[PDB]
Amino acid sequence: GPANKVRFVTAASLFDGHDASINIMRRILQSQGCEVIHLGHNRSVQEVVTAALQEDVQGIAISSYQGGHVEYFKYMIDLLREHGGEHIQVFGGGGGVIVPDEIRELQAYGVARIYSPEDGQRMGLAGMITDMAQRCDIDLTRYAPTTLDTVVAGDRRALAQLITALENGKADPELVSALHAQAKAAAVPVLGITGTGGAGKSSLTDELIRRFRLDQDDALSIAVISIDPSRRKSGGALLGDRIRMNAINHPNIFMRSLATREAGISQALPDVIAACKAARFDLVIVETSGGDAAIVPHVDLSLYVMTPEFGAASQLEKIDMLDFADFVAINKFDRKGAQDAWRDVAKQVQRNREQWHSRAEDMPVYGTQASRFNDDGVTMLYQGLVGALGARGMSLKPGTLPNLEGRISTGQNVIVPPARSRYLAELADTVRAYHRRVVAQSKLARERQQLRAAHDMLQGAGHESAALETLASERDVSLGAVERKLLAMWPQMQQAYSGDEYVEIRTGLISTTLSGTKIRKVVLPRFEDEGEILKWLMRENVPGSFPYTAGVFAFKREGEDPTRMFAGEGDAFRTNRRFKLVSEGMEAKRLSTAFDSVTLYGEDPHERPDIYGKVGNSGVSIATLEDMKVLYDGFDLTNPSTSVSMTINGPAPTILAMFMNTAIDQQIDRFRADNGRDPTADEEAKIRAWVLQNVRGTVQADILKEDQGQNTCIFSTEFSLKVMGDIQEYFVHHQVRNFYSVSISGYHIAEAGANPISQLAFTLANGFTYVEAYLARGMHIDDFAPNLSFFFSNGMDPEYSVLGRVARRIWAVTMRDKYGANDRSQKLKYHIQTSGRSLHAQEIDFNDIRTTLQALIAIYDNCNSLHTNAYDEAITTPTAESVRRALAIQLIINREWGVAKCENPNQGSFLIEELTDLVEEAVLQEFERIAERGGVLGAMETGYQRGKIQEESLYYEQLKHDGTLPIIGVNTFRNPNGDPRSSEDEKQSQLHRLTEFHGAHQADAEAMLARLRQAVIDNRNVFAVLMDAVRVCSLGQITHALFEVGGQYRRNM
């Protein structure tokens, strides 16, 4: 532990989701005795600086892995000098993105240190943190004011420094007494908010502060004192209440996180409060963790916060806080037994107050749900607090908020009903039951054949025993209806695949080799045993037949390969050229779009250094519908041989609306060109409706994965799911049957370290959650199931070879048995991308070897779409030459490779069938573990997924570093000889195209945006409005509109 109390503010830069490294740095800082105010990811400079200034820290640690770091730090250094924080030292992350010329530049600008990857290897990760902590080991109490004149005047930076003095007991004794004297005469209300651990203390507080801002039109000056007993023996702590605060980013709001001993509230808080009271605030809010009623004698009003899980009704007779609390908030009122929790608590408070002459429903016990946007429950609690604070001497304007009455929150958008909690377990039983039938029916089919076989052998010998036939006849009825038809069609099935054509229409079955050998596309088994035949027909039928283990289609398509390559760079014009380069000479126009971090967060490009640096870098910059049209110019989106994939999650409904309008306008253009006249009202509507049906493509939009470790979500999970459903409803209404609403991904999960079994199980579980959610909404299974794309990562692990086939069978069986859906719904279609986790910077030429083997098993196992990574993936975005080597891997396997001429080469293999069985079972067991945690959503409350992933990640690293798990070129066979974005004009282009778009729709802008908000308030279809909104509004405008009526995502520690 250092001399002074070293405080830090840590965060990831704006639009930066790579918050994996900064969460490691804040651990080492914490362990070395530093109080860390962690801000999480996606933090603007204006945010980080405001935090640093209010907390009054010695140092700031910022990680930047999305680029644009130079403009970012320059902004922060500038903004810190302007608002009295030049003594605060800014540090750069361990990102190897920043070249030496930029490190030297920024350090010369004002940045304390930027640690090069060279410094990482030399000093060590703990070494860099130790250096950074020692630099910030300075006393900040000397910068504190000596007169209250500054603080009382309204200076918040002076207040922040004054507190640093008061907290360290280095303030003048005469100054302190004069401070309390000022506070006593100030007469300002102090609300205390205490509660049990993990009850939503900060979440509810933030929402309550938001209530204050909305109700009083940001007229109130609120100071927030967060108290966390994390301060260990080393002196280090973690102050993570600020990360959950979204409504504090405003000049009238001030927040200070205090780290107190885990044993003993020190005599510092009543001073800190007095300081805020003297700073002429309107209201001081003080919150604590796990409830400790050591805050009661220091506040005017106390608020006990709890969850419905309090145990038996007798436990409430032990809680001292229920005897003092002026208000009680039962937060997370969406949980089970919340209703009974309310009556138990309300009765207990009535008993404690001995108010038998009152109604239990009148008690200050509120059922709140801070997680739900604009929750009336929270508002009801707020209405109560105001009346209490108002009577206790506080000036308040008449409220603008709906002054509704009641005590409990009025329900919520129930995603997965508690009755369907065990849905994953039910599916596990569904599959296992199918297998037990396979075993039983197989034995029946075997015996039936054995009897009639032995019966015929007796007639050839002479003596006959018809008693054998009596037993065989019993087997005929014992065998199921579908099982019997399977064996019946088997000889006929063999004749079909026997010929050279699959005879109406015909299809080639045989590809003749260079030697003259005939290679059958689909090779059928040669089993004599009818038990084996039935067993095979039920467990792994031919491609295109239930359970579609070897594929969902009969034969691989001649027109389109599974090839679909990831692209996206600079502005729409540049990517449009890269799209043509990849699909050069191919009838199969299969595009895969990647957006820049600015677009991925639903923002418009802007001059501000925060955003400007990010524009165009690492993905195409798409801000308006015009940009979208340029992106796919020339390409016929409605053409049957053209599918367009696009990677977007948060802003997915808006981007999809743009893509739809683009595809529609392409045909309106093609009509005005072919006829020379614009289509009439009836002609246009006929065209528009046709486009929606026949348009092919896929948008990712996996929201549940964004809270699984990616951390790139901008909207509240509940809101996104509502709009997600709005899209899926829209697809149904207009018969959009060629577009996939959500590409349920598991790639990001795998990159995080998850082994194949975990990746597959979680992804399927997530997919099943989306299914359960839509069913609870009221959609039919055959309406949304055929619109479900999947996304997996292929690594080197054995389980990857049988991943796709397992995913297909688990889906096909459950969809037919559990949900009773049609054939089109039982067919799981997925996209496989080779693993980037297996691609290393050490010996990059080896990566093509790994990417080949992964591509092979993907193609072997009849994947629906394949992306191949470049050999220099660990260093930069795929270059021009390097994207050809990636594309050649697919071309060589599909065209040159002989075994690939056969479309079911996996089938029959003893290894494949065993691995298929093993992996399938392992997934089912994982389904069960998640089910007994409340389903996927319930498990995410515990952070079960994120936890397991982080575990398996470290187990991989524990073996890779050790040498147990060999990696060629990395931990073995190391090389003796080998020791070791976006044009400025393009950024200006996007800015000009934006302001040009904005001026062109200035009249219809606000009108459309207001309509969009009202559609959320009136609980209408959001996507339906977006289909009109994107034609007069930009991405940023639409996103910001929804922020006001859908709320922003709240960060998790």
Ligand SMILES: CCCC(=O)SCCNC(=O)CCNC(=O)[C@H](O)C(C)(C)COP(=O)(O)OP(=O)(O)OC[C@H]1O[C@@H](n2cnc3c(N)ncnc32)[C@H](O)[C@@H]1OP(=O)(O)O
């Ligand atoms: C670090 C960041 C990494 C990332 O995020 S990368 C993610 C990017 N996303 C992707 O690469 C893939 C996107 N998803 C997709 O392309 C699709 O969802 C999918 C299902 C994988 C592929 O779709 P498509 O290739 O267009 O084909 P499809 O399965 O939708 O079906 C099209 C219709 O055409 C027909 N068809 C195509 N191939 C056939 C065949 N072999 N046999 C018989 N019929 C066939 C068929 O009619 C089918 O429609 P339907 O099955 O009758 O409803």
